[PDB]
Every structure is written in structure tokens, then in C-alpha cells.
């Protein structure tokens, strides 16, 4: 049996960003989200009431990624400056201030994900990946093997492994403990811009610049292919649903599409953005979907 | 319908919006200039005066921010961020490795509607300039409008000001259906 038509309406609009946004991340409590702008702003939005809790000012205006800690105590950012900045929220005072300034990369920071309150996995532009320790800044593990600059990273629910996608048409699974490549999947003709694990933990989906979404499983092959002759532009963000039946994607023709993870058919269009979609996020309880674009407006759908 | 804390949680948001407006009033009044060019161009950023470098210089009561990357490696990805700039400063000192470079930059998908300033850091001089203008003339009819120069000097802060002035003037004229 299929799913059928799925219609989502814009419930909230998080206006307030000066310039275009690349990254946003949902919180653990499914209430607060964080968004990054190119004018040097990290803004924390209360989703329900459309408020603004924090308006942190950045050091370098060129930021390409953002992350929210699982405990909600820290927020991370990075970009062209080769520095990963960590900000503490629950400080003794009333102002958010930097706590760690990681300087170990030579390319450009493209992704950063928190493992625990003291660990973070960073993906940069020099075709390597790394794992840091926040307390004593260092790189205990430095994953190697990629050729092009790496554009996306995603951890697993168990946090045992994390797949990484670079601009070389290959997705590599890594091991957090040993720190070596475990498997490589090559099924793309162009570079990869997004990646996300299946909720089960034994599969993931990759988006590339040839308007194709690919679904790999840890059988070691590609199970499906999401593509249509109408769509030609690239894909920026890919995310799954809570159960895993749906698959949302971002496109450079300003119209996010919804896909079926089993039948591989279009089942709804999340149109409404004035510019290209650059970030997409599904909340932990699966009650909402947040999308950002280059018009500096965030939209929530349900 | 709102508790006592819910009113202060809206007052704080209003103050945040006030600060954001006060910050945007300053953000809108500054011009950002990307600075490209090969290793041998000699890039000037010191005579006007980490994976990126920003130099701030003010000319005739207006101020600009010039960005130039120094520690990067393929510019295909991090060039998309630099599409909200006023003009691109391209410095050239060789040829056919810089020429192709310029051809690829001008014909970029994301760098459309962004004009380029072309520095050259009597019969011989003009041949290279014509070669450079050939690509700018073969595409981008009504959007890019590149501007060549013959620089080395202490007046490099006036040419950028004049070309930015020209770009904004043409944009304003174009917008009012006056051009």
C-alpha cells in the first residue's frame, strides 16, 4: 500500500535574520532551535511562541554550519575561518560567551556534530574528518581517505559509526573507536551535498548535484533511486521522518520535495520559499519540519 | 491569557529585535568586496592597510570590507558564499592560466549579476586588456559590467570607490526604469 497525497501548511515564520542562512539545528526537547546567518548571527528560536531567546554575535561573518548540544548547554559553529567556536548558554551570568576555540583544520569547516558534552566530530574542506576533545583541545582521531572536500556528516543513533560524504561521488562509513574506514559506497556521478542515517541505523540516504537521491544500506549496495525528468537542479539537504517512511529533500529551484522511502514516488511538495532551500530539519518527536532558505526566513510545517 | 513570565519573554524578544534593527542599520551601510587573483599578482592589501583575511578601509566618509582567502586549497564550493558582494577585485600580474581563470569566474552560475574589477598589476599593454575584455564582452549583456584598470601606487583606494559608485548608480538607474 502507498501513502498518498501529503499536504503541509506553514504554521510559523521565523523572520528576523539579516541575510541568508545555511544551517540550523533542532534541540533535544523539540522546542528550541538554532540558526546561523551570513551576517554573523546565531539566533535561538522558541518554536511554539516564535520568540527569540539568544542573539549570539559571531567573530567571522562566514559561517557554514551549526549544531546544538544534546544537553542544550552548548552551541557550536564554524566556517571559512578554520575555527570551531563553542558557546556556553547556561553560564553564571546573562551573556553567552565562547568556551572553546578549536584551530586544527586547514580547509573550510562544513559540518560539526556533538557526540557527547565533551566530544565533537568535525568535517572540513581538506578531505579529512576529525574528532576533538572540548576540555583539552586536540584531535584524538583524524579520519583519512577522502579525496575531495567533504560536504556532509551524520552520526548514528547508537553513536558507534558516522557516514561522511565528500565531493568525490563516494560515501564512507567510519569507526569512532578504531578510527579507520570500514566501508565505501560509490553510486553517484557527481559530488554529494547531504547525508542522513535511517532511524533504524542500518541505512542512509545521500543527495547529490545531479538531482538524484540515493538510498544505501550498511548489504553494501544502493537499494533505490529518487529522480524525475522535471527536476534538474542539485540537492542541498536530506532528512528522514520519525518512522522513516517519508524522505524530505532540499532543492536549488526553491521547492522542497517529499519522497516515499519504500515506493520511491513523489507524495507532496513543500513550496513556499522565496529562494533556494539550504537547510532542512526534522524534530525528534517528528511533530514538525523546519526549513531555511536564502531569503533569511525560516518556515515550520506540520 | 499570558502569565507574568510570558510578558517578559516577549519584552526580551522585542529588545532583541531592537538590537537587530540597530545592527542592520549599520550592516546596510557597508560594502563588501571579494579579492581574487593568482599567487603571482602581488596581492596591495598591505598598502591599503587563519583561512580568511579582512581589511577595513574608509574612503571619503564611506567604509568597505575587503576579504581574501589565504589558507584554502577547488574554489567551486566556497565561491557560492561570495555572491552577496558589491564587486570582485581581480588582480593579474601568467597568461592563459589567469585568462582561463577569468573566463571560468565570469561564466560562473552563482556569480551572475556581480560585476568584476580587473586590475593589471603602449601598444603592448592594450593587447592583454583587449584579451581580457573579450570574454566579458561575449557574455553577460545587461548584468555584469566589468571595469579594467592599469595599476601597480597610492591611489588604489579611489578607483574602487569610483567603480562602486558607478555600480550603485547604474543599479539605481536600472531600477527606476531610467536606463
Amino acid at each position, epitope marked *: 500500500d502507498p501513502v498518498g497525497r501529503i499536504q503541509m501548511r506553514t504554521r510559523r515564520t521565523l523572520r528576523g535574520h539579516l541575510a541568508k542562512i545555511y544551517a540550523m539545528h533542532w534541540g533535544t526537547d523539540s522546542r*528550541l532551535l538554532v540558526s546561523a546567518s551570513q551576517d554573523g548571527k546565531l539566533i535561538i528560536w522558541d518554536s511554539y511562541t516564535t520568540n527569540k531567546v539568544h542573539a549570539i554575535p559571531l567573530r567571522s561573518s562566514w559561517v557554514m554550519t551549526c549544531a546544538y548540544a544534546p544537553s542544550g548547554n552548548y552551541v557550536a559553529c564554524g566556517g571559512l575561518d578554520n575555527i570551531c567556536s563553542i558557546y556556553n548558554l547556561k553560564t*553564571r*551570568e*546573562g551573556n553567552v560567551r565562547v568556551s572553546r576555540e578549536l584551530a586544527g583544520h586547514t580547509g573550510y569547516l562544513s559540518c560539526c556534530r556533538f557526540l557527547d558534552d565533551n566530544q565533537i566530530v568535525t568535517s572540513s574542506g581538506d578531505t579529512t574528518c576529525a574528532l576533538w576533545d572540548i576540555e583539552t583541545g586536540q584531535q584524538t582521531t583524524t579520519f583519512t581517505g577522502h579525496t575531495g572536500d567533504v560536504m556532509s556528516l551524520s552520526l548514528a543513533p547508537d553513536t558507534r559509526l558516522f557516514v561522511s560524504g565528500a565531493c568525490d561521488a563516494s560515501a564512507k562509513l567510519w569507526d569512532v573507536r578504531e578510527g579507520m574506514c570500514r566501508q565505501t559506497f560509490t553510486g553517484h556521478e557527481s559530488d554529494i551535498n547531504a547525508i542522513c542515517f535511517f532511524p533504524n541505523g542500518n541505512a542512509f540516504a545521500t543527495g547529490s548535484d545531479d538531482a538524484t537521491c540515493r538510498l544505501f544500506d550498511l548489504a553494501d549496495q544502493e537499494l533505490m533511486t529518487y529522480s524525475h525528468d522535471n527536476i534538474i537542479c542539485g540537492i542541498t539537504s536530506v532528512s528522514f521522518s520519525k518512522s522513516g517512511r517519508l524522505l524530505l529533500a532540499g532543492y536549488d529551484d526553491f521547492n522542497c520535495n517529499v519522497w516515499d522511502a519504500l515506493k520511491a514516488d513523489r507524495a507532496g511538495v513543500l513550496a513556499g520559499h522565496d529562494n533556494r532551500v539550504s537547510c532542512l530539519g526534522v524534530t525528534d518527536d517528528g511533530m514538525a519540519v523546519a526549513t531555511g532558505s536564502w531569503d533569511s526566513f525560516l518556515k515550520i510545517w506540520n | 491569557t499570558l*502569565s*507574568a513570565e510570558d510578558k*517578559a519573554a516577549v519584552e526580551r524578544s522585542k529588545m532583541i529585535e531592537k538590537q537587530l534593527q540597530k545592527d542592520k542599520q549599520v550592516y546596510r551601510a557597508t560594502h563588501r568586496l571579494l579579492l581574487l587573483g593568482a599567487d603571482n599578482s602581488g596581492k596591495i592589501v598591505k598598502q591599503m592597510r587563519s583561512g580568511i583575511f579582512e581589511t577595513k578601509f574608509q574612503v571619503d566618509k564611506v567604509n568597505f570590507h575587503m576579504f581574501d582567502v589565504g589558507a584554502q586549497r577547488e574554489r567551486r564550493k566556497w565561491i557560492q558564499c561570495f555572491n552577496d558582494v558589491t564587486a570582485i577585485i581581480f588582480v593579474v600580474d601568467r597568461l592563459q592560466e589567469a585568462l582561463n581563470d577569468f573566463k571560468s569566474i565570469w561564466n560562473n552560475r552563482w556569480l551572475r549579476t556581480i560585476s568584476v574589477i580587473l586590475f593589471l598589476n603602449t601598444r603592448a599593454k592594450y593587447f592583454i586588456r583587449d584579451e581580457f575584455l573579450r570574454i566579458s564582452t561575449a557574455s553577460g549583456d545587461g548584468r555584469h559590467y566589468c571595469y579594467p584598470h592599469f595599476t601597480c601606487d597610492t591611489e588604489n583606494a579611489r578607483r574602487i570607490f569610483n567603480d562602486c559608485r558607478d555600480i550603485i548608480q547604474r543599479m539605481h538607474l536600472r531600477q527606476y526604469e531610467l536606463l
Partner: single-chain antibody
Amino acid sequence: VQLVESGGGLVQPGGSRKLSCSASGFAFSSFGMHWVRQAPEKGLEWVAYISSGSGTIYYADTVKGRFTISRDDPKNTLFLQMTSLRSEDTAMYYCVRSIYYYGSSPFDFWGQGTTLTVSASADIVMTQATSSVPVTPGESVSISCRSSKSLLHSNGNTYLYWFLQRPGQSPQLLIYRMSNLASGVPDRFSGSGSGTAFTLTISRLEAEDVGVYYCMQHLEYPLTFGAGTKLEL
């Protein structure tokens, strides 16, 4: 974080005074301030409140037209001017800092306070069960409190606060919104309630849990603390 007081003493009846709470070590401009009054023989009371940016000023119904409050953010110093002092103004005053965003903990720090000795409306009334509960060390304590109205709001929050005043220092926050634990307080203390009846539970007692326990409501803004329960060891 340090709050100190300047002012106080003895004045003629119907005179004037200026009391200044000065701060050091935290971001003043992002905080709102409350003024708390405590009689030498009675419980706590609230007299004035200033928001952030001076956009919302609140006064108690008793002193709605006799006290004024103003702050200097660049000077990081707040003050109140009192005129026409009556015979019910002899007390000790504290300045309290509170911040209101999603998940914040208001009334999280209290100053030392200054003493003033003067020479010669529907609101929630909250009653403590017993004014003096003596308990043995290292035993469970089940202090109770009753409210005249359901403190629960339609959004879920209840706005129930607890305060402990040791014999000599200012009151400190223990529980906010009936469930959350303060940063400095250990895990021994716990709180529960159902809208009208509130319970504060202590598992094990040490040589420093002697003091007076005051309750709090924050739903309808005119607020009263209560006499409290003086734990006896």
C-alpha cells in the same frame, strides 16, 4: 556576582531616603530586578519591580505612590527613593535579580540587604500548614503548603517557587516551577504538587538544613510569600 546595599539608618517620620543596590560581576543590562522587604519579626514581602530597559515598572498596592525605583545601566547601579515614610517601613531590604526566558530560573540570587529603622485588592493568599515543624536529623520531611487559587496555567507551567533562609544569610532559591532543581542545591530536596496543594520533601538532613522555608507564587503578579515554616533541630 555580588550585590551590596548603601543606605539605611534612622529617620524622622514622614521623611525621605535613598537606598542603592550596586552590582558587580554579571551582565546587569540583561536582568530585571525585584525589591524584597522583610520585617524583623515577620516574613518576606515584595515592594517594587523594574524590568530590563525600564519598560515595565510594578509596585505593590501598599506603596503604589510613595516609592520610586530607577536604575543606571552604564553605572550598573539601581536605587529607590522613598518619601513620607510611615511606621510600617522599618524592615530589611534585599535586591533580587531575575531573568525571564524559556527555561530561565528567576530569583536565582539575593543580595545582603540593608536595614531601615523608622522612629516614632484581591490577591492569592497562601497559608503554611505548620509554622514550626521540628524534625530529627537524617529523616524525611514532608512540608506542605496551600494556595487560594490554582497556580497552574493553561500552558502547563505552575510558577511555584521555594526559598530557604538560614539563620543569618539571605534566602536562596531551592525549587522553581515545582519540578526543577536549582544549580547549587543538592538532590536531597524535591517538590511536587497538583495545583492547589504543594509538598516539599527532604530525604536526609544535615547540620546546615536549619532555617525558615518560605513559599512563593508568580501567577497573578501581586505576590505574597507567607509566614513560612521554621525547621527546628
